[PDB]
Structure formats: C-alpha cells, structure tokens
Design a protein around this ligand. Sequence first.
Ligand SMILES: OC[C@H]1O[C@@H](O)[C@H](O)[C@@H]1O
Ligand SMILES: OC[C@H]1O[C@@H](O)[C@H](O)[C@@H]1O
Ligand SMILES: OC[C@H]1O[C@@H](O)[C@H](O)[C@@H]1O
Ligand SMILES: OC[C@H]1O[C@@H](O)[C@H](O)[C@@H]1O
Ligand SMILES: [Ca+2]
Ligand SMILES: [Ca+2]
Ligand SMILES: [Ca+2]
Ligand SMILES: [Ca+2]
Lengths: 312, 312, 312, 312
Amino acid sequence: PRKIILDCDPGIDDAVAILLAYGNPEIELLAITTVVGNQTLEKVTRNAQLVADVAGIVGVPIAAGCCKPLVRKVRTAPQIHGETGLGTVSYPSEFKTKLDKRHAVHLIIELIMSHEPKSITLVPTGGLTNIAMAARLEPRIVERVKEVVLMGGSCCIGNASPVAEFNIFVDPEAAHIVFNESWDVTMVGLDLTSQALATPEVLQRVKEVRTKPADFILKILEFYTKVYETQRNTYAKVHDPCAVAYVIDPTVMTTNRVPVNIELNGELTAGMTVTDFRYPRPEQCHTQVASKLDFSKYWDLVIDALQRIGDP
Amino acid sequence: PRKIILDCDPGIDDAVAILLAYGNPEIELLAITTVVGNQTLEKVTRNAQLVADVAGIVGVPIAAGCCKPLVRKVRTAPQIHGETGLGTVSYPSEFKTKLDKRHAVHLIIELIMSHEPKSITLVPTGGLTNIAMAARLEPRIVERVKEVVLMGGSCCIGNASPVAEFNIFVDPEAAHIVFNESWDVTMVGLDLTSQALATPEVLQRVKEVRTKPADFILKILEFYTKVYETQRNTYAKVHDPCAVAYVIDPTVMTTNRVPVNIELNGELTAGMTVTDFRYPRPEQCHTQVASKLDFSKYWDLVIDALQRIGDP
Amino acid sequence: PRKIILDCDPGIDDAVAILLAYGNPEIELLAITTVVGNQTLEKVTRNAQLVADVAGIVGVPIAAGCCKPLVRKVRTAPQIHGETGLGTVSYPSEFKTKLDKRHAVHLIIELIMSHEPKSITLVPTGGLTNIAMAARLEPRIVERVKEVVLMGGSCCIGNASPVAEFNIFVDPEAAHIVFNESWDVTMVGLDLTSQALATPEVLQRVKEVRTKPADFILKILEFYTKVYETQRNTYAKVHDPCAVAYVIDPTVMTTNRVPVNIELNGELTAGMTVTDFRYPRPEQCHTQVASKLDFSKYWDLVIDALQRIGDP
Amino acid sequence: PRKIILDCDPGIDDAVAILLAYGNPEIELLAITTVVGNQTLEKVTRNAQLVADVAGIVGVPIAAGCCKPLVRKVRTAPQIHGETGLGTVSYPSEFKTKLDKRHAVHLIIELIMSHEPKSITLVPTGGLTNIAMAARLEPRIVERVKEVVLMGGSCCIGNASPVAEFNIFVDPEAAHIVFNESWDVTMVGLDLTSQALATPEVLQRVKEVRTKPADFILKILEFYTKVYETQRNTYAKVHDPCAVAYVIDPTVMTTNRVPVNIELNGELTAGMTVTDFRYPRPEQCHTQVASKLDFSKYWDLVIDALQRIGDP
Ligand SMILES: OC[C@H]1O[C@@H](O)[C@H](O)[C@@H]1O
Ligand SMILES: OC[C@H]1O[C@@H](O)[C@H](O)[C@@H]1O
Ligand SMILES: OC[C@H]1O[C@@H](O)[C@H](O)[C@@H]1O
Ligand SMILES: OC[C@H]1O[C@@H](O)[C@H](O)[C@@H]1O
Ligand SMILES: [Ca+2]
Ligand SMILES: [Ca+2]
Ligand SMILES: [Ca+2]
Ligand SMILES: [Ca+2]
C-alpha cells in the first residue's frame, strides 16, 4: 500500500476523501493534518474528529496545523460548507478521537524524516500552508517525499475567482512554495474535479451502502448538492477524493506534464495556477496537471471504501 | 452590407482577412488602418499596400496608425510572419495603392463621426492601440460605433505567453481601454481561432481558385504553415479572418456573453483576457467570447471571397 | 522669452501658475490646455476661462483636452479645490474668453510642429494624459520639444497616497509614457513644492498688490489655506507655479539628475515616482528632480507677475 | 536588563551588533539566531560562531534558522560583506562555540513561551524569515513578545533597490507578516542608520580600545569601509547595532509613529517599506520609524561595550 499524509480542511468533500483514504486497502493513512480554509482551523479540526468518530478511525493521528495563511487574510467558505464546515450535521458533546499534541507541521516533518526515503506521498486537499511551512522549516523533506498529489488549481475556469481555485487562492504564497520545490507535483485541479459529479445515481449508490458512515456521507452530500444546485447550477463537484483516487490508481485520470507556476501579484489573477501548454513542453517537467476522469472507476472507489468501512 | 473599418498589422492572416473583407459582398470595407504588432508599423503598412496592389483594391484608404504601444515596449513576431511580415514574398519598387495622409486614429474618428450612428463595426485584428487612442481622443465614437469585433484574447491557452494572446499582450493597456468602454465587444480569441486550421484540403482549395491573388495567399500560407508545423507542431491557425467572418455571418461561430477584463499587473499573467464563466452570468453583459467554429462555413467564405476577387 | 504651453487642471494653484506665466516677461505663453484632474474637464476648463477673463488674457488659446485618464478611473479633488474647482468664487453667465475649437492634443502637436525646433517647453501641472497622448499620436514632437518641466511626483511622501503625488496618481500610465520618452524632464515634485508655503506674509503681499486679479488670487488662496490648515495641518502649498518659476529662472530651485520611473502595478505604490539616488548616478540622465526652493525669489516672481498684470 | 533575542546574518555590522548586545549591561542576550541574507546560512552561522569565539561568549545559544526566504530566491551580498560574509578574516579549524541543536524558529518559540509574558524583545537585523515563521507556527508568541525592534526598511532611499532596503528586499513576504502582526514594531531603517557612520574618529576610538575583539572589529570595519568608499562614495554605515542601541536607550534616536506596510507586488517597488506620514496619523499606531541618531551616544555605546568585553 501507498503511505500518505492527508492534509485537509473538512469540508464536505474532504470528509469523503478521508473515508476513501481510510477504506481503500491500497492506502496506508499515516496522519490526518488540518489547515484553515473551508472554515476556521478550530472548526475543520473538529470536523476531522467527527469524521474519524463516525468511521471508527483508530491509530491515525489527527494534528491541527496553521490557523492563518502565510501572508494573506483568512478566507472561509461557509456559503459552500456551512457555518460549521459540514453542513447541518450535529456534533457530540465529546469526541472519541482525541487530537494529537503535535502541530501538523511538526508531525509531517517527523513522519517524513523517520520513514524510509521516497515512501510517503503528501496529499493536500486544502490550502497549502502546512506543506509550505514544513518544506521551509525542514528542507530535507523535499527530496525525501515520494511526491505531492494535491487537489487544487485550475487551468482555465476558477471558483474562488474567475480564474483561481479556492485552495490556491486562500494561500497563493504557500502554493508558490510548493509548486517551485523540486519534488514531483500532480495538480488535480478543477478541470478534472468538475467531472466528479454527485449525480442522482451516485447518491443512490451511497444510500444503498446501508451503513451509518454512508448515511453520514449522504447527509453532507445532500447539503453540498443543494448549495451547488442553488449557487452554481450544477450537481455537486466532489473534488478532494480525486487526489486520493490518483494515489490508489493513477489510471483513474489522465495527466499532462506541463510547467505550472503560481501568480502572486495580479490584480485579477492572484492565486491562478498558470499552466504552459504551448509547444514544446520542457523535458523532465516536475509538475503534471490532471485532465480527464474515469467517472465510473472514481465512484466505484468511493463506494467500495464505504462498503469496506462497514458499520464500525 | 455591413460597413467596417479593418484595423490590422499584416501579418499573413491579416492579409487573408483583408481579402475576405474586400471580396465578400456583405462587407463594405471603409478603410484599412494599420498598427505596430506583427512587425514594425513601416513594414505592416507596406504589407497592407502590397495586399491592396495584389487584389486591385481601389477607393479604400490605407492609413498608418500608432508605431508604438501605449505604454509597453514594441514587440514584433518575425519568427511567425518573417522579417518582412509576409514571409518570403517580394515587393515592387513602388506601390500602386498610395497611403492616406491621415493618421489612422484621425481617419477612424472622422469616419465614425461622419457616418450615421450605429452603422460602422470596428474590426481590429492587431494590437488595440489605435482603437484605444481613438476612443480617448474622441469619446463620442464609443456610443456611435455599432460594435467592436476583434481577433484577440484567449480564455485559457495563450501564444505570446502561457496565458496571453499576442494582440492583447503587445498592448495590454490599449486592450483594457477597449474592453472597459460601454460599446459591445465580441472577442474572437484563440479558443475559436485555434480551430481555423489551414489543412491540406484548405490549401488545395486555395490553389484551385486559380488566380494571382489566390496564388499570393497560397504562397504566404505555405510559409505560415512551415512556421506553425516547425515551431508549434500544428497546422497554421488563420486567426484574423474569423473576426471578419463573424461580421459577415454570426452563425459561423458560437459565442457566450461573459465578463471580460484585461490583466495589467500580473508577473505571469499580464496581457491575459480574464473571463468569468462562473454562474450566474451578469445580465446585459457588453462582452461576448467566441467558442466553436463552423469550419466548413468559415473556409467557404474565404474561398468565395477569393473567387469573387478573381484576377483584377 | 521662453515659449511654453501650460497644460493644467485649474485648480487653485494652477490659476496662480497661469497668472505667473502670463505676467512674467520671460515667458511667452502660447496656449493654456486643460486636462481632467482636480475637477472634471468641463469644470477645470471653465475655471481656466474664468482666470483668463479675470486677468484679461487675450490672444492665448484655451483648448480642452482629455476628459478621462488613459486607463484608470476619473478621480477628482473637491476636498482640496472645492466642488467647482476654484473654491467659493462665482462665475459670470458668459465668458469673454472663448474656447479654442481644437482638442488640446491637436493644439499641442500643431504648435510644436509649426514652431522652430527646440523652442517650446511643455509645462504640465495636472495629470499627464494630454502630453502622453500627443507624444504617441505624433512621435516627432518628442525630439522637437525643448524640454518638459512638470509639477508632479514626489521622492518620498505623497498626498494622494502615502507615496504618490496627485498628478502622477490620477494617470500613472500617462506619466510612464512621459518619463520614458527621450526628452529632458524636470520633475518639480512635492519635495520641492512642500516649501512653496502661502504664509501670512505671502498672503499680505498678495493683498497689497491692490488689483482685482490679486483680490481673486487672495480669495482662492484663502479657501486653499483653510483646506490645508484643516485637512493637512499646514499652510497651503502652492505647487504649480513652481514649474513655471523654474522656466523663468532655474536658479529658483536646486535640482539633481537621477533616474526616475513610474510604478504602475504596486498594490500600495501605484503612481509613485520611483527615484534612484544611489551612487553612482548614470551619466547623461534625461530626468532631474527638484530639491530646495529659493522661497523669497519664488514669491517675488509671483508678486511681480500680479503687479505687471495690474488691473486690465 | 532587557532580555533580547538577536536574529541576524553576520555580516560585518551584525558582528558589531552581537558585541554591543553582549558587552552592554542593559541587555540580557538570550540567544543569537541566524538567517540567510548577507551570505548563505552556512556562512553567516559560521560567522556568528567566530564572533562568539573572538569575544568569549559562553552560555548564549547560537541556533541556525532558515536557509531560504519564504517565497523568493536567495540573494546574498558578497560585494558588501565579502565571499565569507566577514571580509578578509581567517577562520579556525574548529570553533569553541558549538551550535545549538534546535532550529532557530524552535528556539525563538521555546524562549518566548517559557519566559514571563512581555519580557523578551525580538531584535532582527537580517531578513525577517525566522521571525515570520515563528509567528505563524506559534501565534501565541505575538502577544507574548514585549516588542520587535528591527534594523530594516527605509522611508525614501534604498540600497538593494532604488527604494527598498536589503533586509526587507530579501524576504518581503516575511516582512509583511511581521509588520502586519499586532505586536509593537520599531523600524530602525536607512533614514536612521545612514547616520551611523564609521568616521575616521570612530575607527580611531575602536583602535584605542586595545583588545583583540576590538582589533577584530577594526579589521572587519576597515574592509567594510573600503567597500562603502568604493561602491557607495560614503563612509561605512554600521546599521545593525542601531537596533540594539534603541533597546539599551531609546533616547539614542528619535522615532515617529506612522503606519507602515510592505509592498509585495510592485515591479519597481517590491520590498519597499511604505510609510504614511500624511496628516492625520492614526491613533494607537503599532509601528514607529526611527529618524534622527544621537551620533555621539551611539558610538559611545559601541566603544563602551568593547571596553567591557576586554580581552577574554
Ligand atoms: O476548490 C475546491 C476546494 O475547495 C473546497 O471547497 C473543497 O474542499 C476543495 O478542496
Ligand atoms: O495571436 C493571433 C494574432 O497574432 C498575429 O500573429 C496574428 O496576425 C493574429 O492577429
Ligand atoms: O499634488 C499637487 C497637484 O495636485 C493639485 O491639487 C494641484 O493643482 C497640483 O498640481
Ligand atoms: O541594509 C542594511 C542591512 O543590510 C546588511 O548588509 C546589513 O547587515 C544590514 O542588516
Ligand atoms: Ca478541501
Ligand atoms: Ca493580426
Ligand atoms: Ca494642478
Ligand atoms: Ca544584517
């Protein structure tokens, strides 16, 4: 199995990504680390604990990371994930899954420096603040990581701005750090995740798993669906598990190696992932961008993970 | 017929656009105005005169405009259009078509203020310097123009930069002026013109027109083809007549009304046409962007214009 | 005498500059051209006509120029010059001084191309829009002008922003055009004009000229004084005649030749005149920046001009 | 005495600042932390060890921090501090002063969280990378610090660029983090430190201390002098001890409370400390900028520290 660290900001689709990573046997989930983004750090961390309580995730540390972007002001997304960050779910008075005492940045560094070289894939699905901080605090992690597979970016059409995707937009400086390090980066951007639609058939399949964790996922996906239908005129785009799915089986999506850099100073374009598709593409390009999704394979992976989790 | 002013920087595809505008009976070509861009102003103006000499264009003033962009340094494209701006053609010792004494900006203003309101379409196919200058020198032209239909811009993939198209890139400030005036603007960008391919069948049809102007077009298109095949790994994209074709018959391409603005200060993205496709689109949007080309109709229009010009 | 074109946006200190240029025998005032800035173009043009009516200026064309900056939105300064642009003065039902039929940009070009080379100094005391437009529409004026002496800019402390001075701030693109042309430019910036204080002794000297034009100047300077005392905690800074004064007698101020460029894209610094005082200064630098004012000589020039105008 | 952490990049004037902090009895020097800047991190850290060996500094941890700026590329200053970072001094085969095992960022956080609140002043005299990293990794340090007194910035004239000072220029993002946190910041910028001249009388006083550490300081100051005389046409500006001197005795310099922010995106002005001196100044402004130096008091403090260190 592939060892990963899942760095996230749950977040309704982050929650699905946690359960895909936990339920799929090709993934060894070493840690869930949280970052400010969809909601404040306090809220997304509580949300990660709720997901772990729901699915019975034991032995996987949950560590809270950065509560602010590197440079820019905090921006949250309650219009998409709700004031709580998980729609209309309710919370227990106390969580079974306790928080790790280590800052996420410290846990990321410790895991990378103590595991064998080239064995851990970083899977960020929120802003890149923790990843950037870790890379600058312990530069030896950059060559030691297997690769980075992140949900974020967009070649053309944004969501947080006309041209920028939310995870990059909320911390462009951190994204610039990650994309300009020498490690291999796979950008699973909106071009790809716009295809990860929670169609009625998908929601029906989740309902038919017939477990409490699947009921939980269906509940938050039904909230997420109403927001996307109302605010965006589409079915809900379940972005973040696409990054975990690539690690499970890269044939779940096509990719193209192209140069990618992060715009920091544009008036209209700050937070854009600027991609260069012009001919010729440079050789030994360390960045690749995802393009076409195997829709059936993707949702089969999500459903299979929910089936394997069962009713803990 | 629709009256137009064709503002251009010939330029191999500009030359095709001149002949489409001249040969098609739905266009009343009022003037050919030139601007620095593909080559220096002196060269592109001589090239416009050569095209007029080749096709026997009489009674249409050719006026030279701005020799520098508004703010940024002159950038030419000899790697695409040759050191002369028209590939390997030869020039007569003297042109039959003489240059108008008026600066292009003055001719544009004079034509718009003397013709009936809402009767003239501006068709820019180079940098937007002359159009911007005219709008600022005589602001009354903005409401008097029928509309602006320009070749330029790109929603996603650029040519002059990863994300910017040449005509916008060479004078972003002038583009910002044009796109932020109240007149209707149709942006016939690279998304559209990347489909205007000079395939072998197209070049064969040009050869079979069997006229000296068609031979001229075939010659410059064969140069243009070798440059695109070598530098870009595609057939040649014959961009500029797409803007004239829209004026002839808007059903030759689909369009979408979306907000468009011009990035001026990005490190990576200066010169980008930033388009906002997010839902919901604003009402009464004064900009629209072209999307899908009717390939057969487009090339039929070009071939028909060459047939109608005949051998003058 | 030195021929000048005074390009301005009256504007209380512009009005003083008009009368200094008109009254001083070392200046041959060829034209008053107006630009949007302190107020709308309509208002500052009416204000120029009022100044000409008050002082009996005959045979000097007043031509209205650009009503918008090149790229950025119109910004006016009614908090400094009043809703009318001249404080609380009243206007006649009809002006004696009629407006020239030519756009200011056309008049500037015509004057420069018809007078002997190197004989006319351009003296801008508003935004640089007209000057930039003229330079781009007829590039031959750049080498034909004697030099440009402008009121604008600041090495350190701004007024319109922390670091930018108003005339540059309201059209940074036009300033960038002017400062990057090859002509000699003298920047009479806030470092200098902050010393041009209308102290009680100065206002007393204006009162003692005992003419109707001096009464007019005293009236607008008393408004200007109340605004500066209230909003800025200083006496009024009478900036614009400093540029005319340099043309009369360059020993009225010290200058330093240093590179100067215009910031266009900074979030905080757009509109800054970026000056490079670091050692070593380049040779044959075409820009110089004013530093120390001969306070007594400056106000003696203003008072002498008012005395020479007398009561027309 | 005032507890400080001296964060620095020795650096010839940093070396003087270390000895002022060590020798003056009003300072309790808790740590010397190093950052990339004047030279690579490896070199400036070795240089800090050499200074500690020369002056016999025991019981003060030296901890190496960040080897790269947050976002931008490494920039060093061998033209000012030499290829080694300390001019032409020689190095022992082994240092007596050993390096702390903790990263500087970890040591800064540990010291602030373990000492009483509001007892430690941070004194950065290099790029602000470590300070910014510490503030983001443990946000509780921001309210716990007494204040930040840094050498960096400039109101008007820069050194690394026309308008930017080196320490801000080499990591503008880190500076933006520091200046936009709620802690009190005193900016001891070039306006102030340009007055800290190593005149012949100053160098003579250093020579007359007649100790090996003073000989060391004289040697590096003589190199520093030759660089400033040759490259800058001034005596050497000994910047960094000015920040320590303010902590010893704030009356050694005047200050003004004014808003200060950091320009990140300007083409010409990135790295500028943008100061707002316009009237009125906001109340309870958390930033102040140094202005006039008590030259005699400043150099008396430096000489007295060298005398107190003696010959260890
Ligand atoms: O732009 C998509 C990203 O933004 C969030 O709303 C989602 O969790 C996802 O990571
Ligand atoms: O980017 C396409 C544009 O650039 C030029 O090379 C062509 O003439 C066309 O107008
Ligand atoms: O910044 C000074 C400039 O701004 C205007 O208010 C004055 O007329 C002057 O030209
Ligand atoms: O700009 C002055 C700063 O730059 C360095 O050269 C000095 O050590 C000082 O900290
Ligand atoms: Ca997420
Ligand atoms: Ca063209
Ligand atoms: Ca003015
Ligand atoms: Ca230093």
